[PDB]
A paper describes a structure:
Sequence alignment revealed that Vps75 is a member of the evolutionarily conserved nucleosome assembly protein 1/SE translocation (NAP1/SET) superfamily, members of which function as escorts for histone (H3–H4)2 tetramers and H2A–H2B dimers. Two histone chaperones, Vacuolar Protein Sorting 75 (Vps75) and the Anti-Silencing Function 1 protein (Asf1), are involved in the Rtt109-dependent histone H3K9, H3K27, and H3K56 acetylation. In this study, we solved both dimeric and tetrameric structures of Vps75 from a pathogenic fungus, P. carinii (PcVps75), and identified a structural basis for the inability of PcVps75 to interact with PcRtt109. Therefore, we propose that Vps75 regulates the HAT activity of Rtt109 by affecting the interactions between histones and specific histone chaperones rather than by forming a complex with Rtt109.
The PcVps75 dimer adopts a classic “head-phone” topology, which is characteristic of the NAP family. The PcVps75 protomer contains two major structural domains, a long α-helix at the N terminus (domain I, residues 18–58, colored green) and a α + β globular domain (domain II, residues 64–221, colored orange). An acidic disordered region (residues 224–250) at the C terminus is truncated owing to its flexibility. Two major histone-binding surfaces were identified for the PcVps75 dimer, including the disordered C-terminal tail and a highly negatively charged region that included residues E192, D193, E194, E195, E196, E203, and D204. Within α helix α7 of PcVps75, a highly negatively charged region that includes E192, D193, E194, E195, E196, E203, and D204 may mediate interactions with histones. Similar to many histone chaperones, PcVps75 contains a long, disordered tail of acidic amino acids that interacts with basic histones, leading to charge neutralization. However, the interaction between PcVps75∆C-K5 and histones is completely abolished. Finally, we revealed that helix α7, which is located within the highly acidic concave surface of PcVps75, and the CTAD domain are both necessary for PcVps75 to interact with histones. We also noticed that the PcVps75 dimer is much more stable in a homogeneous state than tetrameric Vps75 in vitro.
Residue numbers in the entry:
A (entry chain B): 19 to 139, 145 to 168, 174 to 217
B (entry chain A): 20 to 139, 145 to 220
Amino acid sequence: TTSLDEVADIELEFEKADVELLKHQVELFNPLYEKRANVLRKIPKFWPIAIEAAPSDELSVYISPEDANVLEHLIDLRVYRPNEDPRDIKIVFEFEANEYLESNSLYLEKLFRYSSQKAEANKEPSQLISEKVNIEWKKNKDLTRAPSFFTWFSWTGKENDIFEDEEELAIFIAEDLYPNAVKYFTDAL
Amino acid sequence: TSLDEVADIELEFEKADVELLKHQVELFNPLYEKRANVLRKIPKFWPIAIEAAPSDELSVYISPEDANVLEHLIDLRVYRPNEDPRDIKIVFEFEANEYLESNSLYLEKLFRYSSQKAEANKEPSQLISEKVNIEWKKNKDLTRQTKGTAPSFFTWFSWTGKENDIFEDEEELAIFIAEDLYPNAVKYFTDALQEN
């Protein structure tokens, strides 16, 4: 067992501490977020304003002028880490009634699961996989057919192992947009 | 208003970030010490990891001559030794070389989180620091450059943040060392080791 072997093993210990730390983060921030979320819902167009105020190259860049008409009715956004593996992120979008989305799809939920295999096998690592989230577009308002922001909901990451815009966006929502929504909104004044 | 309620809540988030960082420190302190003991057995680990780290955050500030000094960097440590876990101490240790006198082989730079500075242009300046004295051997002082306007990496040690600028690249570098290079060092090293 070389020093090179020791280092790789110790790195596995760091991964476990990372998971322990996220567990603690989950306990800490869940009540704060729930409490924040029910105040934010009373602030008209809080989320499209915060998204617009967020760095455009992180999100705004992917949003059509038409995508923006849908997102104008985004009334709620939430991020969860609901699984025993705290690295899985669940992102929720809720829209008020509008001209584009059938009312079944006014609530859209997407789950990104940490993958052992994908993480194990540039090399800026891709770690996340997801299931296609179905959207019922109103006839005939389907922006999924430049590309629409809403195509992000079909991404799976199971086709290759490149770290793509969709996965990076998922992390931005979870680790930046969501914690900082209030700062971004206030920046907008 | 319901926007002044958001305010009160936002202060709770701020208390929680700090609580969370405090837990992080107790959690990782011994892991870093264990890791550091093994890394010291691995020659050139730090210059190899510095080199493999993203160039746009680090090696861009490193002239070839700087790099030559860094070939002799035998240890790098980051501490959060104070009450406020946002205070960072960054420690460089060098083996003997042509550039540093023996009492500058150990270089220590502390950054304090200043809430007054942080209260006052998107990732605004939050840290303050003291100049770290470096004793250079005769005619080896890399910070002494008039022409050749690009500052040696080593001018970073004199940054204080006590008088403010628009951006503070130096602070950005400090955070990168603390929050990216040091935690991801083994990952970076491994990328190089396995660029086969």
